[PDB]
Structure formats: C-alpha cells, structure tokens
A paper describes a structure:
Hypothesizing that a serpin reflecting a highly conserved sequence may offer insight into the delicate balance between folding and function, we designed conserpin (consensus serpin). To design conserpin we used the consensus approach and a previously reported MSA of 219 serpin sequences. Characterization of its function, structure and folding reveal a serpin that is inhibitory, folds reversibly, is thermostable and resistant to polymerisation.
In order to investigate the effects of a highly destabilizing mutation on conserpin, we introduced E342K313 into conserpin to produce Z-conserpin. Z-conserpin expressed well as a soluble monomer in E. coli, which has not been possible with Z α1-AT7683. Z-conserpin showed a highly similar inhibitory profile to conserpin, with an SI of 2.3 and a kass of 2.1 × 107 M−1 s−1. The equilibrium unfolding and refolding curves overlay almost perfectly, revealing a midpoint of denaturation, [D]50 to be 2.51 ± 0.01 M, an equilibrium m-value, mD-N, of 5.18 kcal mol−1 M−1, and a stability ∆GD-N, of −12.8 kcal mol−1 (a loss of −10.04 kcal mol−1). We therefore repeated equilibrium unfolding using bis-ANS fluorescence, detecting a fluorescent peak at ~2.5 M GuHCl, that is slightly broader and more intense than observed in conserpin, indicating an increase in the intermediate ensemble population, but still smaller than in α1-AT. Regardless, the structure of Z-conserpin reveals essentially no structural changes to the native state which disagrees with reports of structural perturbations within the native state808284; therefore favoring the mechanism of Z-variant polymerization via a folding intermediate.
Author numbering: -5 to 312, 328 to 361
C-alpha cells in the first residue's frame, strides 16, 4: 500500500539518475561534448510508466531510482509545476508521444500524461516521409524554432516514437562586459587548439578548490533562481574527476563553496547532445520498454513498445591575490534549480 513518494525521495532518485546517466554517456562517447537534461528524461520515463505494467513498469521505476511499488506521479507533477513556475527559467520543452493511429489509446493515459506531466500524445500514420516531417515540425514549434530537424531517419514498422527536446539560453545575474572579452586559446587536447571568445569578469562568486579531486568549482547564478555549477579539473585527470562525479561529491561541493573574489575566464560556447534513449537506458536496466513484448497495456490494449526514443538538448552561453578560474581546457558543469535542488542539465565542454 505504498503511498505517493515524497519530494525528498524524488530529489534523491532524480539526482542519482542524473549522475549515473552522465557516467554512462561519458563512457559511451569519450572525447565528445555532452549535454542533456536528466530531469526531462526522468519525467518522460515516469510519464511512460503511466501506461506500463509488469516487468516493463518495474524496470522503469527502479531504473529511475525508485521502489518498484512507488507512486511517483504526484511528486513529479508538483516538481514540474515548481520548475515551470513564472519566476523560474521558463524552460520551453518539446515533450511528445507519437503512436500508430490504428491503435486506440486509453483516455485515462491521455488525461494523466497531459495533466501530470504536460506531455502531449498524438495518433499519426507512420509512413517515413510524412511522419518524420510532422514530428520534426512539432518539435521545432515547441522549441520556438530553436531545435529543427530532430529526427533524421524513421523506420515504418514504427509504432511508437518518444520525443524529448529542449533548448536553453539563460541570463546571468551578473553579465559579462563585452569590452573584457578577448580571443584566447582553448586547449581541447595535447594536439588540438581552438580559438574562442574568452569572456572575463572579476567579482564575488561562490567558489571552492577541491584538493582531493584536483578541481575548481565555481557557481554562476542565472536570472530565474538557478545556477550553473562549473567544474574545472586541474591539468589532466578529467577522467578521474568524472569517476568521482557522484551525488555525494556534489553535496560536499555545495557545502564547501564560499563567497570569494575570483578572477573568472569563461569562453562563449554552444554545445548540444542527441541521444538514442534505447541504447543509453539499456545500460541502466531499462530494456523491456524498447523491445517487442513490452507491457504498455496502460497506453493501449494492442501490443506496443517504444520504437524510437530521442532526447536532444542545446545550450548557448553568450583583494588580496584572488583565485583564477580560467576555463581554457575541457570542463564539466551542472545546471541546478535553487528552490528544488533539481539537476536541470549536465554537460561537458570538450569542443567549444
């Protein structure tokens, strides 16, 4: 008789899911830019769990970091409402489910997926031509034309397509002066150098030098009650830092940050990540959902499974003897929402 999970349970589960997801991507695609929204992915899977049953359902909840018998829908609704409050970042998310029109959808799923997660389901004919354009145009519309041509290919024994895209360009609480921006070398690796517009700013920032993990941590507050936590590893050993990237480590960092005079150098960069959720969540124990035989009877009585699941996230960033924070080599970052502590984005900039 497990009642609705607490907000604190959701915070723990999503954050564990966030870091385990990064850890997988960092080993899947090394030496590559990483950028994704863990909370967005958690929400999409939680939404699908509305129509999931049996082992299909169990794998999702446990994969998300919850008990098998947990009730997560009340908590997620409240979380999403809080994240999408007017004083927040006002993230525009393309959150849609596309299923074969020949399949009758349960109105309970349609109601709950929209009411609890603001997800929109659609019945479409899945011929590769018209279907791809229809979905891509919708995603483009939902993201104010920022994310175009999301789907590149599409089989046509395709019965169910999950789409989840988000573009983010926030405003700093303390902006960079363009007169202090200067072109500098960004050292991608030992043999590769990229010229970047290096923004600079001298002032008070919450900052911490991690002796143990050999990295610098700095907090950059956004307008909208969120902040970017930038993690700059010392020379070499970015891999060792990634191995230590845990909810525990994050918590230690947040307690260790002190407001200090810092000389900050941050490059202007635009990065993105595009992920096949089938292959990524495969290593997270969520397998049945993406294969035929899945139990999605809560969505439709006809047999159904997720044919394709795509997540894409795009990010644009544009006394006495103070510490220097110069990000002219690959670095990690998180975007954390202040009120809930929710991890909105995780990323790594290798190629700016």
């Amino acid at each position: 008789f497990q009642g609705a999970a607490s907000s604190h349970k959701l915070a723990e589960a999503n954050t564990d899911f966030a870091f385990s997801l990064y850890r997988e991507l960092a080993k899947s695609s090394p030496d590559k830019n990483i950028f994704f929204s863990p909370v967005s992915i958690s929400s999409a899977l939680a939404m699908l769990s509305l129509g999931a049953k049996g082992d299909t359902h169990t794998q999702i909840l446990e994969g998300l970091g919850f008990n098998s018998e947990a009730d997560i829908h009340q908590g997620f609704q409240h979380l999403l409402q809080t994240l999408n409050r007017p004083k927040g970042l006002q993230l525009k998310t393309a959150n849609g489910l596309f299923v074969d029109k020949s399949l009758k959808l349960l109105d309970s799923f349609l109601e709950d997926s929209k009411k609890l997660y603001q997800a929109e389901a659609f019945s479409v004919d899945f011929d590769p031509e018209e279907a791809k354009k229809q979905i891509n145009d919708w995603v483009e519309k939902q993201t104010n034309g920022k994310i175009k041509d999301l789907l590149k290919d599409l089989d046509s024994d395709t019965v169910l397509v999950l789409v989840n895209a988000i573009y983010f360009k926030g405003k700093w609480k303390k902006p960079f002066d363009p007169e202090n921006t200067k072109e500098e070398d960004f050292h991608v690796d030992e043999k590769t150098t990229v010229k970047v517009p290096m923004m600079s700013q001298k002032g008070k920032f919450y900052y911490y030098h991690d002796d143990e993990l050999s990295c610098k941590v700095l907090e950059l507050p956004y307008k909208g009650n969120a902040s970017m936590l930038i993690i700059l590893p010392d020379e070499g050993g970015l891999q060792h830092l990634e191995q230590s990237l845990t909810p525990e480590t994050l918590s230690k960092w947040l307690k260790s940050l002190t407001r200090r005079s810092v000389e900050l150098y941050l490059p202007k960069f635009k990065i993105e990540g595009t992920y096949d959720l089938k292959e990524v969540l495969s290593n997270l124990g969520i397998t049945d959902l993406f294969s035929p035989g899945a139990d999605l009877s809560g969505i439709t009585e006809e047999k159904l499974y997720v044919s394709k699941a795509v997540h894409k996230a795009v990010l644009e960033v544009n006394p006495r003897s103070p510490p220097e924070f110069k990000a002219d080599r690959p670095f990690l970052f998180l975007i954390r929402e202040n009120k809930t502590g929710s991890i909105l984005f995780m990323g790594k900039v290798v190629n700016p």
